[PDB]
Ligand binder design. Sequence first.
Ligand SMILES: Cc1n[nH]c2ncnc(N)c12
Ligand SMILES: [Cl-]
Length: 146
Amino acid sequence: YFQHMKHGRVFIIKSYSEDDIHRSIKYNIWCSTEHGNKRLDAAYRSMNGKGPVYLLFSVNGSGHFCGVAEMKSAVDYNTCAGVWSQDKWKGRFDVRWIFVKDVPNSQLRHIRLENNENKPVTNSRDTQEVPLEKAKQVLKIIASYK
Ligand SMILES: Cc1n[nH]c2ncnc(N)c12
Ligand SMILES: [Cl-]
């Protein structure tokens, strides 16, 4: 249960590669775009441990979110090249996967993001930030979905 969360920031991850998500679950690491890496680094560092950064993962075109992971370190920008599905993916940070489970978009699309033109949360791009009150609604639904 994620209702205890008073602080904390939540981002959507949209992957072109399901293989990269499988690698991320296996080794508890992730990376993002050049902009996404800077956005997440800033958010993690500004938290100063006062609350979590959660990542809500979804494979482009799958019609479902596939789980949730907590960001667990700052971004190292200079790391081994070519570990992901494509060479463009640079950098690395630790994550801890909290839920690994498929949740259909139909369960989530009523939740709209006031910072993204009131678009459904299921129509977000990679690294879209989610307002906390809408993030808690998404997390409650992922956690109790069966
Ligand atoms: C890897 C990775 N990090 N962030 C991403 N976003 C879209 N596609 C991907 N393969 C990735
Ligand atoms: Cl590495």
